[PDB]
Structures are given as C-alpha cells and as structure tokens.
Write a protein that binds this DNA or RNA. Structure first.
Ligand code: MG
Ligand code: MG
Ligand code: MG
Ligand code: MG
Ligand code: MG
Ligand code: MG
Ligand code: MG
Ligand code: MG
Ligand code: ZN
Lengths: 113, 79, 148, 127, 207, 102, 59
RNA sequence: AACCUUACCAAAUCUUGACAUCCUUUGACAACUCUAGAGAUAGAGCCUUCCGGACAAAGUGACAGGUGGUGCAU
RNA sequence: GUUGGGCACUCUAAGUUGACUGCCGGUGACAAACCGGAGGAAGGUGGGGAUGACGUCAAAUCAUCAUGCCCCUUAUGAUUUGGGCUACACACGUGCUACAAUGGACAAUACAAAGGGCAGCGAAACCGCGAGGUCAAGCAAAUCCCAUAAAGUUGUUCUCAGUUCGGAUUGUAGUCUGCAACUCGACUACAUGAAGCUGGAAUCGCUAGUAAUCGUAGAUCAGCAUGCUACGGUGAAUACGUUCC
C-alpha cells in the first residue's frame, strides 16, 4: 500500500505508482525525483525509508478520493445547471461536440436497435 | 477568450447590465448574444436568450459564471 | 489469356555464409521492407541452432527444408476433381520456406528467433507443424493418386 | 593516380575515384561499415571486385548524396564498375556479362489521379 | 469525352494569346486582359475578328487583333481605332494602343466560319446546306482538312440532334498538326444551338 | 574574389524567348565591353495546378496544368557606361522581364 | 442570388475575417485559386483558350 | 460550413430595390466622431466641395432581380 | 565550401547523339513476323503520362456558366442578427488508430526528394514541462526561411498479462487564430484509461522499384486535413498454365 491502495510487487516503482487513480507516468517520475529513489527498483525490494519518502511526497497530491470527488461534483454541478454538457451527461452522449450520427459508442453503449 | 486577453462580453449587454445595476431587477433583458461570457455581476438577473426562434428565459446563478449564455438555450429540440 | 512464363527474379547470397536460401528466407520473413529486422532474427536463430544442435547451421537448416520441402502437390480441375502433380523444384523450396515461417510465427511461444530455431530443429528431427503440413499434403495426394 | 567514375541509383549520385590501396572505403570521411549498416550492402558493393578478382588492389574515396543507404550503395558499385573501365577495359566482358555496368533504369513511379498510389486503387464495392 | 485541341497544342506549336510575365500583380493584370477581351462586344458582330493577342510590357499594351474587315474597324481615316483607344483607356488606365493585322482567306478561319454560320442560323437558314457550303468553299480555297458540327434543337424540333460533316484529314490526335478550332452559339427562339469547326491548313513546324 | 559586376535575371515561361534575348544582350555586352560570364541557367521551378475536369461530380477524373518559370542568369563583369546604356536601352520582349542589380 | 452575393463580396465588410473569395467572371465561391482569382472550370476554359500566360498541360 | 460562405430556418426590416441602362435636379465622393438598437439601419456634428467630363447622391418609369421548375426543351 | 582558387567531378538547362528489329544466327510462303545473340546505359510500343474513335446509358449537371418555355415581382426578390447544414433508436460505404515482442518507452547517431514564401516564410538567442510568446536577422530565391525527415542503426528496460499494447471517453489548467471558439476550431500539459487478443457469411487492391510500410510538401486556408493532389526512403513473394468464374 501507498496511498491507501495496493500496488503490484513485480512492477517497478514508476509503473506501479500509475495504478493509483490520480497518478500517471509524469507524476510518478516527478514524485520519484522528489523522494529520490531509483526507478529501476521494485517495491518487493524497497525499504521503509524509500517507501516513506514516497508516501510523504504523495500526500501532497490529490489522489484516490478527492479526485473522484472533484470529477463527480463538477459533473453534477453542470447537470444541476441546465447546461449543454450537463444535458449530454444526463443523456449519455458525447460532450466535446462530436457527431452522434455515427461512431459515438463509448458514450452510447453497444448497438441497440 | 480561452486566452490571456481576458473573457468576452458584448458591450451593449454590459451597458444594459450596468443600467440594471440599481438591483431592482424588475425586467428581463432581451438578447441575441449567446457568444458573451457570464460575469458575477449577472447573478439574480433574468436573461432572455435567442435560441433561433424563441427568446427563452434563463435564471443566472453563481454556478454559471465561467460559462456562456448559449449553454442554456438549446438550439436543437430532439425527442 | 496469359502469355508464357516470364523470368523469375534472382538475389545474391549473404556474406555471413554464402547461400541464396538465406536471402530468400529473409525476403519471406520481412514485413513492410524491414530487411534489417529480418536479418537480425535470422542470424540469431542460426546462432541459437548452433547452440541447441551443436552442428553447422548450414547443415541443420538444409536438413530442415529437406524434411519440410515436398515432392508432390494437388490442384483442382473439372464436378471439380483435385489432382496430384509433380511439384516444380523451385516451388519445393518456395513452399518449404513458406510453411516454415508461417508456422514459426504461429508457434505462439515467446520470441521469433527462438521460434525459428525451434522449427528448423523440429524439421531436422522430422517433426513440427511444417512437417505436419507436408504429412497432410502427401496424405491427400496419395488419397487422390487415382486421378493423375 | 586516380580512376574516376559516376554512379547513380534511384535519386542518388556517388562520384567515385579509385586510388591504389588495400580495400578500404571511406565515405565523406567515414568508414563504410559505419556509414552503411548491413554487410549485405558491402557485399553488393564489393561484387565488382568479386567478379573481376581485383579484391585487394584499391582504396576508395567518395562524395555521395541523394537517396538512402541501399540506393547509394548500389550507386557506389555502379561508379566502381564504371571507373574500373578506365582502369582496365579488359574487364569489360566480365562486367557486361555480370550486369555491373547497367544503370538500373528503375526510379519510383508517379502518383496517378484517382489512385492512392501509382497502382493501388480505392476499395471497390458495388455497394 | 474529347478536349479542345488548341488547349492540347498550347506550348507545343502555338503560342498563348497572352505574352506577359508577372508574379505579384499577376491576377490583377489577368482580369485587366479579360476586360479588354470583353470590350470587343463593341465590334465583335460587325468587324469579324478571329483572335486577339495581348502583349504587355513597360507600362504599355501592344494588343493585336485579327479580322477579315479592317475597314469596319479603322473607319474612314484611321479615326475609329483612336476612338477605341479612348474608350479603352477609360477602363485600362495604361498606355494602351492597338494594332490590327489582316487575315486573308477569311473563310478558311475557324471562329469566322462558325460565327458566320451562327449568324445565318439566327437568320433562319438550313443547317445542313450551311455546313455543306462551308466545307466546300474551304476545301476549294485550300484546306487539308475541315470538320463542322452543329448541335441543338435542330429544325425547330422538340428533341435534339448533333450532326457533323467533313472532308480531307483532320487528325486531332496528332501534335504536328496545327489544327485551328472554334466554337459559337446561336440564340434561336427554340433555344441555344452550338456550332464547331476544326480546320486544318497544312503542316509547318514553327519550332 | 571580388570585382564590380552588372548582373541580370531573366524569367519567362518558355525557353525559346529567354535564350534568344540572352544571346542578344550577351552580344551587346561583348560589343561595348567584354569579359562577360556566360548565362547560368537555373532550376526552372514549375507549378502544378490540378483540377477536376468535370463541373459537378466525378472527382476521380482530373486534369493537370503547369507553369514552368524558366530562370536564366547572366553576369556582366566589365562595367562601362556604354554597357549600362545598351543594357537599359533594350527592355524587350514582352514575354520576359529583366532585373538589374547595381 | 449570385448577383447579390457578388455585390456583398465586392464590398468591404464590417470585420475582415468575414471577407472571402468568389470568382470574378463567374461568381462561383468554391475551389477558387487566388494566384488567378479564377474558379477551376473557368480556369480550364481560359487555359484551353490560351488566354492565361505560361499555363499548359503537364506530363 | 464558428460569422461570412449559406441557398435553409426565426425575427427585425426594404419595395426602381443589394446589381446594371436611360432621363431630371444638383453635386467632386468619402472618411472621422457621438446617440439608440442585436446590428443592418435612423438621428446627429459633419466635409464629403466641381475633378463639356467626371463623382456621387435624390426623384421617377421603363426596368431590374430569382441557387424557383423543367438536364425528358438546349 | 567558410575564403582563396578552379569549373575537374556533381548539379542545373538549352542544343544534340542513341533504340531504329538498326546488325548477326536460325525458323518461316525470301514476305510479314517470330526465337536467340553481340553491341549498347537501356532491346523489341525501354518505364510511366497526356492523347479517349462513330456512338450507348432520353446517364449527370438549368445550383460554374449561358439559355427557350413556365412561374414570383409588397415577393418564390434583397439586408442584418442568431441558429441550422456538426441532430441520432439504427443500416451501409470509404479511410485512420489499434489489437502487440519483426513490438512499447527512453539516450546517441545517419541517408532524401519535391514544393511553397511580402506585410509572407520567420534563423538565432531568451522565457515556458509543452502548445507557444518577446526581441529580431536574412529572404521577392539554387543565397534566407518553412526544415532536426521518419521508418533505421546501436544501446538500456519491459516479459506475453487487457499489460509500460491500445488511446477512445471524460474532467481540469492552457496556447494560437479570429469581432466572437457553448451551440461548433485545432494544438498542448496533467489525470482517468473504453471496446479491442487479428475478425462470420462474404469480399477488395496489386505482376516491380509494384503491393506493404515510413515520414515530407503543396492547393484551398485568418484558424482547422485521419481526406485530395504531388514527393521521395526501405522493399517483397508469385505469376506452372487457361482446367474453371
Ligand atoms: Mg475518391
Ligand atoms: Mg473563409
Ligand atoms: Mg452560416
Ligand atoms: Mg436528375
Ligand atoms: Mg433522364
Ligand atoms: Mg433559372
Ligand atoms: Mg455535410
Ligand atoms: Mg503508450
Ligand atoms: Zn469563375
């Protein structure tokens, strides 16, 4: 565990940190710079000091909770106002102005007919 | 304007809001300018936006500022 | 509607060891003009078959093709009958290498070089899916030998 | 002394001169095996000397441009084969018979309208 | 189907009708040239012009016309051309000045033949004999090929026909040829007819 | 090296006018002077324009035109008032346009 | 409507980005090449006439 | 195809008109700025000021104008 | 190659030579032609393009254009703002990205063509993680610019998993253009990480520098390109034969 969530043992550090919601490759590299470990390491072999350096760096960064809250609350907000994007969120249709005549199936689900 | 120039608002609309800045707010303001940005000086007003065949009412709130009037006058009626 | 046989292409042998088959195999392996990647994995598989069977890669590779390189082949003619026929000596090599690389790609194990070495090795040991292709080919040729 | 000769392949120009040496090719002040990746290209390039047995009698100096590595290598064997004529016209029969001195007429075709390439046409469907 | 032979032969054995270089002011000068080529609506039906070669150089326009009737364009004493220049500077605003050169064997020229017979068809004469006398008089004047073609609501018909007659050799696929082409249109009350003509004169290479 | 020079750029759309102007001005410069560097031609950069032959549909049937701006350089070394005068006093034909550099 | 459109395009407009291009002898707004200010079909016509400098078929 | 394009739609508007030819009155034309309006447009300061010949406007009737139909009239 | 020096070589583009069954051998009704060979850079219309016959589809276009007839002329005409042509329960066509190890990421390094450029291309330097921004040089061209081509090659690391493949979708902070990017621009950074593990019946392109793959430029274009047109780099296999569609 690092940020209240497990991470793989056999994946290296830079990659394992990416299995948090909120933390990607860039942030992982920058975190490992700040809490200076090597990227080659693997968390089955890391020590208490290394792991705690990392935890200390990670605590400053919104992740595994507040990030889900930010996203959900932003969407609920734009729905509570009768906005275009929030109408689209309420209907299950694309938001960025794609065309729904064809090829919108991530937001529409599979083919219904 | 999605950019360092600061937002966009049409000048006539700004003037009419400053005219309505006496806060009595008896009247709906009419408009066609969906292009404009909403400011915090529009709260508690009632704007009447042109969708293409109707000057439809929209009530302004504080959750509506980094947005546009056009977000609240859907031009496409689909059932 | 076609005219006579137009001349076949040619190539030059590799300088690593001198044989046309290596270059032909390379061009067969190559995807999208990546002759280099072809050469690399083929060199590596010859190294690894020098390792596995401790003999000359030339010998064991020629032996592999000579096991997976048929002498018969069917066609279809007219109801449509399928008819055996003498294979051409060029088509022998063509089909041997073809089967070799296809089933090497389909061996489904880790790496391409290891696949190739395994398949030439099984060929030399008169096994493998390439040899299986040749088995089924002579099978359905002799079960249609009545139609020559 | 020198024996000059031009070479061309696809969009390539290798001006080439042979000076008596041992068999080392420098290309724009670069060793040929470092310039070119694959030894197949050096074999193709040394093929003239391979036929005419003059393999170990010359060193080489090159200014090349245009095209890619295989193209300019084939340009180099062409320029070699045209310079060894100045060296020794007796080699001409071997080189003619072998196919060294033929400028390959091949050059990349032109995109034709309606077609996505020289030859390839759009996906045809009756519907 | 087929194409304008003059367009195919441009650069090959006939010059453009427009000799001037320009890089920045180009299209402006082109539309100027086009206005000049338009302004011939003051003498087209009368003077029987063939074609116009506009040259431009050093603030000057060495235009040239080709006609069968130089008299109806010069006037009585050379005053009509100066009248033209003065009508035309008004729309050009450069040192305009016209040239005029003859074309003899007026009937051996393409656009002249065609617009002649279009004028005739607007005067309501029979298209068949019209084409026929054209081919005959041209081949008598000396022509190693003529072809003619008319298409429209012929005979005042409700449906349309094309016909065409020829004599000699008018090879359109050859590029040594120097075949002259033209096209015209007749405003008939039934609609619009379209003549053509493909006259061949004789092989001379200019280069 | 460096020396005085009167250099000229010639541009038309076909070569038969460029050359038969250039040889003329060559002759004038070696009349009133000498030591002229003969004409250096240039890459002749053309400009392809592609069209659909049709009006409404049938895009797959095209047509290709081109201008070929044939560019021609001469450098007149020997500077003289005679040659500047002879070279400015001939601004012909219309098909070609010159450019002096002084 | 082409004549009123030509009028509009031949006038200057309120803000410049609104400005645009339609051919001159025609008024076709599409596929206009601005080294000529000519639509493609009128371009083809005038080139076959030979009335454009330099242009001719290719290859 | 953000506007324009753009034709379609809603609204606000115009009816010799957005464009052309002719006649009468005059006139050198704009532009710049202010108010109201969504702006097109109206109210203004406003000069735009004569280069037979020119410019624009204003009045008027011929006249315009139509990406409206017919490609089975051309 | 920067200057000195030269136009050798390359390259550029004008004039020319050359491919003509022109020569030889053989076959054949000596003919026509065919097979093979020498020479030559190329040999049998050298490779490719442009060139599309009388005519067929009463094919398409009256919305490039013109045009007979008809129809509207306080309207079937014209101005402006705003919207829509970007909708979506679905079906089809044509292309792009992928499904991974002939591979992903990361550091170093290499070889092109062809094209465009004036209120337009914007070198270098600096700032910013990046899209970019400030100052600003050259450049109306073989001179300066777009512009470091990529695939590659050599190294490290990943280890056959919905993964370090994939990169949709969505949220945030931003840039550039524009009179204004919600309707409805592109691009960027961060975070998330969809189906998808090689595709049913069927079906398509291609015979050589071709398919396949890799990037590059231009037209339109204030801004927008997975398309269109052009460009070159690497570079196949197969074509026995006309039995059958
Ligand atoms: Mg297509
Ligand atoms: Mg535009
Ligand atoms: Mg619009
Ligand atoms: Mg129809
Ligand atoms: Mg029909
Ligand atoms: Mg009409
Ligand atoms: Mg559409
Ligand atoms: Mg990735
Ligand atoms: Zn036009």
């Amino acid at each position: 565990r690092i940020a209240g969530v497990d991470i793989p043992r056999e994946k290296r550090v830079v990659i394992s940190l990416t299995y948090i919601y909120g933390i990607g490759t860039s942030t992982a590299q920058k975190i490992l710079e700040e809490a200076n470990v090597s990227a080659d390491t693997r968390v089955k072999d890391l020590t208490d000091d290394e792991l705690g350096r990392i935890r200390e760096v990670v605590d400053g960064y919104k992740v595994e909770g507040d990030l889900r809250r930010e996203t959900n609350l932003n969407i609920k907000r734009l729905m509570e106002i009768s906005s275009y994007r929030g109408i689209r969120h309420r209907r299950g249709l694309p938001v960025r102005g794609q065309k729904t005549k064809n090829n919108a199936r991530t937001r529409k689900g599979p083919v219904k007919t | 304007r999605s950019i360092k120039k600061g937002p966009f608002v049409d000048e006539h609309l700004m003037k009419k809001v400053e005219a309505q800045e006496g806060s009595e707010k008896k009247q709906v303001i009419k408009t066609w300018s969906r292009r404009s940005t909403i400011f915090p000086n529009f709260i508690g007003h009632t704007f009447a936006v042109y969708d293409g065949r109707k000057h439809v009412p929209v009530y302004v709130t504080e959750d509506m500022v980094g947005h546009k009037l056009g977000e609240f006058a859907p031009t496409r009626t689909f059932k | 509607p076609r005219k006579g046989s137009v001349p076949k292409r040619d190539v030059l042998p590799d300088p690593i060891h001198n044989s046309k088959l290596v270059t032909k195999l390379i061009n067969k392996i190559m995807l999208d003009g990546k002759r280099g990647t072809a050469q690399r994995i083929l060199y590596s598989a010859f190294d690894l078959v020098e390792q596995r069977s401790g003999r000359d890669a030339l010998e064991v590779f020629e032996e592999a093709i000579n096991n997976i390189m048929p002498v018969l082949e069917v066609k279809a003619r007219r109801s449509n009958y399928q008819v055996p026929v003498e294979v051409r000596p060029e088509r022998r090599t063509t089909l041997g290498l073809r089967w070799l690389v296809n089933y090497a790609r389909l061996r489904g194990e880790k790496t391409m070089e290891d696949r190739l070495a395994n398949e030439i090795l099984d060929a030399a040991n008169n096994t493998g899916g390439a040899v299986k292709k040749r088995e089924d080919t002579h099978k359905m040729a002799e079960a249609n030998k009545a139609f020559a | 002394v020198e024996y000059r000769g031009t070479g061309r392949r696809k969009n390539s120009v290798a001006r080439v001169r042979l000076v008596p040496g041992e068999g080392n090719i420098t290309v724009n002040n670069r060793d040929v095996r470092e310039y070119l990746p694959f030894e197949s290209l050096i074999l193709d390039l040394n093929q003239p000397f391979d036929v005419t047995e003059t393999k170990g009698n010359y060193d080489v100096l090159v200014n090349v441009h245009g095209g890619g590595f295989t193209g300019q290598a084939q340009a180099i064997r062409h320029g070699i084969a045209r310079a060894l004529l100045e060296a020794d016209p007796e080699y001409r029969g071997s080189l003619k018979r072998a196919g060294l001195l033929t400028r390959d007429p091949r050059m990349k075709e032109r995109k034709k309208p309606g077609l996505k390439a020289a030859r390839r046409s759009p996906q045809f469907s009756k519907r | 189907q087929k194409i304008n032979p003059i367009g195919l032969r441009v650069g090959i054995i006939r010059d453009w009708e427009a000799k001037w270089y320009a890089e920045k002011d180009f299209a402006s000068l082109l539309h100027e040239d086009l206005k000049i080529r338009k302004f011939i609506d003051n003498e087209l039906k009368e003077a029987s012009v063939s074609h116009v070669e506009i040259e431009r150089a050093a603030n000057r326009i060495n235009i040239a016309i080709h006609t069968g009737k130089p008299g109806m364009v010069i006037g009585k004493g050379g005053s009509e051309i100066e009248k033209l220049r003065n009508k035309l500077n008004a729309l050009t605003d450069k040192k305009v000045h016209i040239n005029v050169i003859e074309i003899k064997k007026v009937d051996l020229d393409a656009r002249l033949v065609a617009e002649n017979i279009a004028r005739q068809l607007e005067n309501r004469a029979s298209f068949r004999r019209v084409q026929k006398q054209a081919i005959t008089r041209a081949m008598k004047l000396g022509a190693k090929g003529i072809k003619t073609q008319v298409s429209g609501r012929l005979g005042g018909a409700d449906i349309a026909r094309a016909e065409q007659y020829s004599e000699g050799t008018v090879p359109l696929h050859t590029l040594r040829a120097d075949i002259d082409y033209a096209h015209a249109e007749a405003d008939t009350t039934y609609g619009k007819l379209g003549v053509k003509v493909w006259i061949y004169r004789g092989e001379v290479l200019p280069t | 090296m460096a020396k005085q020079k009167i250099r000229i750029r010639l541009k038309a759309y076909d070569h038969r006018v460029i050359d038969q102007s250039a040889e003329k001005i060559v002759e004038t410069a070696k009349r009133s002077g000498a030591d002229v560097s003969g004409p250096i031609p240039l890459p002749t950069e053309k400009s392809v324009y592609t069209i659909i032959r049709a009006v409404h549909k049938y895009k797959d049937s095209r047509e290709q035109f081109e201008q070929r701006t044939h560019k021609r350089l001469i450098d007149i070394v020997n500077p003289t008032p005679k040659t500047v005068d002879a070279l400015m006093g001939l601004n012909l034909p219309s098909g070609v346009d010159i450019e002096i550099k002084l | 409507a082409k004549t009123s459109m030509v009028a509009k395009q031949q006038k200057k407009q309120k803000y410049a980005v609104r400005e645009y291009t339609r051919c001159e002898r025609c008024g076709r707004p599409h596929s206009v090449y601005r080294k000529f200010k000519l639509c493609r079909i009128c371009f083809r016509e005038l080139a076959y006439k030979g009335q454009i400098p330099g242009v001719r078929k290719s290859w």
